[PDB]
């Protein structure tokens, strides 16, 4: 609880910042980043699997700060390199690094993207179905569409030159169209577009989603009712309890645990 | 709780408007209470009455909140409850129940069911509820548009004047467009502009759609069709920055408009997907237009287009036609402007193939005007040479599909007569065309009983097999298909 | 058609035997059981007629020997498995008639000893055909469970479980003292109809198909079929005595027993008395089937999807059964899937309008009773059902030549006993020249696949309307056999 | 190739002049694909939708008879308001009007009951 | 009627619209509503024509009391036409067709005793022929 609270407090402090930065603002930002780096290093050193639940949000918060200033770019770059490149050999962090969004296409992220692509393709090259499944599995982590901006682009590149495998995917999904993967991808893209409304840089996310949805035309999905993704673990935990009061207690405690990480203090 | 919740719902329906969030909260309360077992076991139907509720009002409110399936289920529950209440009172068709609901609640069950089924988008279910007011002109026009009966829709739109003007002209323009009739539509639009200077936004969007589809480049919250027209104009003027900016703006607007609405049905996604596909295809062809144009690049672009069209095999015609129209416009623009180095022959071949495919697709959906327009466009750029081509056979097939058998037979017989002397087993494609034409002529003559079986075998059916086999154009995939078809026809 | 008479260089039997041997060589898993069924036609007497039968048996033995010349292990393993199936089927199983929890299989039964059959796939699975000769990575039988259930019936079929190489269980129904070849032939017809429906865009968009199951005849008297898991007969769901839907939802109406007693006692009466009794019974017996999807799918979207699937399945099954003249469609012969809400038709012995030759003839093209229509929603048969029926009938009309060809091939099969006989007629309705007939059946089928009804040409819509109005006609329903349960 | 006159065209012209309907089906061996012959056939059989589509599609046909056939097909299908708006647009796009178009305009005016329009023709 | 005879379907619709412009549906039906039903039947829209004719028959069942001979002729003609259409479309069993439409038309034409006319004889002949067929 203490680790999660400290990490989320630092993330909230970083995520909000004035557009104009004075000396005191720069000092505060540097102090926050140094504290975050120290906490991450101590957590990963003392416990291997400590950060498998907070790695994605930390990386998504750190990525935009790389190309906003030069003085603090060094620190966030070092933190990212320690999180990804330095701990590439750790088995516990290997699986959670596998499920990370690709870094933006820039010179500063050259080594980071090399390492991330090496980790991602350890087993071998991916097919279109595997790429779509990877995208969907990654999508369940964060609630900020901006972090997905790069990944969407990659998805487009897979959808444009792999239509032959797309035909096979549609053929395979004919037995049970309700769990088809194309309609699931379309629904996920629409939900991500919905979550991006009234947020910073929504136009780029909308453009990427539009390109991805243009790569897949009005294909007959053989379904009428759109079904929204649900948490299997949540359903199993609900079915654990038989008493109504116990189910109510579980639901309330889950909601309180979820809202424990809100920005407001009250 | 029952009286207070019923008061809340009837206040929502009074309209005294209420926020959508409160209605959704109360709908969630009702939905949660629906799934709980009552202390008296009963059945699942008993569990829906934790409170003495009138489910017709709840269904109407849910429909107002775009919960179409929930509204349908609540309407079914209300009808069942009314039937059981009547059976208790005594100890009925949809029309009687609708009258009773209208005279007690003010909402007719048939109209609510029709609205819910229209919102859901399932086609066949639209035929289940037609007991009341099916004579109303707007319902008849919607039925005509659903079945793609454009002549009847045009006649009814022109006849009825009590319909509001904006939707009247919108339907008239749509019906004129779907029947071909491009010059008539343009003159009608010019006359409408003359008779009224004030123009509503939907009429402006239809005007831009007609402008970009008819290839008239003199017209100068941007709508989708306005963005398409501007992008095509910039492409013709070789102003690529504005082209990309307009395409990006159109894409963003389409995505935002789709994402604002509440989505429950897959049928609400198809038009947006079609528009996004059209935008993506135009953007992809932009880079090819910008630089030098080679045969390989055009062939690759056509191959990807054919692959995605194959992916769109089961889609409706209303979602496939705009993409084909945009492809035709793009090909014509690329032919007329960029080509000055005799490379336009390859573009002509590609355009002819695309128009033949469009004719085939339009014939598959029982449309007879679009194939004729496509054949006319083919004839504009292609002249009948000594040897016949595939598009002449496509024209014969179109004429046969239009129930004009004599003209199609005459065309095919003239083509066979020309091929009998023109070809000398030179071009494999020409040989495939020859054998296919012989087989089709034999089948048509057998169907129409215009020839005795002896001549049909001697001149057409056996001749096609002989041409396919003896000429020895082997080692191909199309030849095997043609040989199979000829063998099957002769065997039959 | 195998025999030994027309033998020679160009003899029909020589060419037929060579072709059958080649097919068996290339696809053993699709033909070896079929050949063994002819080889073991009279193995029931061994373990416990005409010249054509002897010739067929000897040719089947020749084919089996030819197959064994290349795959001895597979042949011997399948023969042992078939012997085990027949021995299990021939068990009396009469003392455990009342018991329903489960009975341990006796140790003397050889089926309890067969384990790790690597060369034998599960007979009841649908094996996909691959054009390559090699068959690899196929689920194979490795164990049988020690207990078997009992299926409710006079002959007491046995429900057993087979555990394959993948570790998942498959339920099979072993039947004895009945002919299962007709069911397999009708399943082949249903597969051909499914293939026809799949290649039309109109019926592919609506996902119109016929539910099918696998049947494997082992001899002339016994066989094994695939048990449809997750399905329940509609009669058991609707008119069960302690937990039927009618009892639970309408306690104040007539019970099923009362309706049955009322309808049985009016059989030897006039038609107006039958009609009035039927109308009175229908007045005090209201459909309750619409709740089936209501209590299993609380999510409105899933409920709508399942209801639509049920309606489409009913429409497709009705049209296909009318085309083939399927009869004996009572509540115990139709199953409903509890997960997909789709219908499955079983016990397809009566077909080609042989139910109209019964002493109490069947006067309906298919079962469209009040429960079936009530399960479709408030609209009834006016929405999805009619359009789906029209689409299916258009598909059938557009492919009439192929259907006539298939039915011609079937009707002249020597081993297909489809004609009605007095013994079968008496067994079917119990209350507590061949060439001319085949030609007439073919003529009636050809008339059906066109618009010729009562001598006049009808469109698809008109024919569908006529069929629907005949199926729901109260005078037609009142005149049928009480065992058909028209009021349900 | 000897006289310069084709027998089929002369026979078709003679049969058109005579006016017997069925005889128009006897001579169709040559140039029956020509748009004007197809349009005449469509008008003979009162297939107004096909005639309208073909009239709109073909532009090589002379303009006067093209608009005459378009107006006739629109009139024979009902379509009175559409015809009026089409006539107004045609007047906007071209001030010069041939006498047959003026006569058709007067015919539409008196049939549609629009009393504001003010060698006189029959319809005038 | 003349336009339907020549296989024209737009002019009858325009004429029906013009009729509806000046005429409003009163308690009792008229001949032009039956003409509209015939036009809809001729346009191969059978369900709408059947619905129109059934609504008209339902209104006439309570509106009329053997008062107006023209109304009686319209009633019997509508019953006969509805029976013939239902027989043609196979949307009803023969028993209901006889009991509700074909025999009812004969009963209305005969028992009401609007005799001594020429149109009545034609209507009675048509009803008798339909029932006999
Ligand atoms: N393939 C199957 N899948 C699931 N249940 C089945 C299957 N076949 C039969 N049943 C069930 O087993 C019951 C027994 O039917 P059945 O074995 O046909 O004996 P029956 O009722 O006497 N018919 P019959 O053997 O021809 O006289 C049926 O009522 C079904 O409920
Ligand atoms: Mg049975």
Residue numbers in the entry:
A (entry chain A): 1463 to 1728
B (entry chain A): 1862 to 1876, 1899 to 1974, 1984 to 2112, 2121 to 2392
C (entry chain A): 2526 to 2573, 2591 to 2974, 3001 to 3056
D (entry chain C): 1995 to 2112, 2121 to 2126
E (entry chain C): 2260 to 2392
Study authors write:
Ataxia-telangiectasia mutated (ATM) is a large protein kinase with a central role in the cellular response to DNA double-strand breaks (DSBs) and related genotoxic stress. ATM, which belongs to the phosphatidylinositol 3-kinase-like protein kinase (PIKK) family, is essential for the sensing of DSBs during the cell cycle. MRN contributes to the localization of ATM to DSBs, and together with double-stranded DNA (dsDNA), it activates ATM as a protein kinase.
As the Nbs1 C-terminal half is unstructured or loosely folded, we made cryo-EM grids using a 28-residue peptide (207 μM) that encompasses the acidic region and FxF/Y motif of human Nbs1 (residues 727–754, hereafter referred to as Nc28) and human ATM (1.2 μM). After focused refinements of the ATM Spiral domain, we built a 10-residue Nbs1 segment (740ADDLFRYNPY749) into the improved density guided by the unambiguous density of the side chains for Phe744 and Tyr746. The Nbs1 peptide adopts an overall extended conformation except for one turn of a 310 helix in the middle (residues Asp742 to Arg745). It binds to a hydrophobic groove between two helical repeats formed by helices sα39 to sα42 (denoted ‘s’ for Spiral domain helices). Phe744 inserts deepest into the hydrophobic groove and makes van der Waals contacts to the side chains of Ser978, Arg981, Cys987, Val1021, Ala1024, Phe1025, Leu1028, and Tyr1034 of ATM. Of the two acidic residues that precede the Leu743-Phe744 pair, Asp741 hydrogen bonds with Ser978 and Arg981, while Asp742 is solvent exposed and uninvolved in ATM contacts. Tyr746 is the last Nbs1 residue that contacts ATM. Its side chain, which is stabilized by intramolecular stacking with Pro748, packs with side chain and backbone groups of Gly1016, Gln1017, and Thr1020 of ATM. The ATM structural elements at the Nbs1 binding site, including the hydrophobic pocket and adjacent cleft, are nearly identical in both the apo and Nc28-bound structures, indicating that Nc28 binding does not induce any noticeable structural rearrangements to this region. Additionally, no significant changes to the structure of the kinase domain were observed when comparing the unbound and Nc28-bound states. F744A and FRY to AAA mutations appeared to disrupt the interaction almost completely, whereas Y746A showed an intermediate effect. These results indicate that Nbs1 Phe744 is central to ATM binding, Tyr746 clearly contributes, while Arg745 makes at most a minor contribution in our assay.
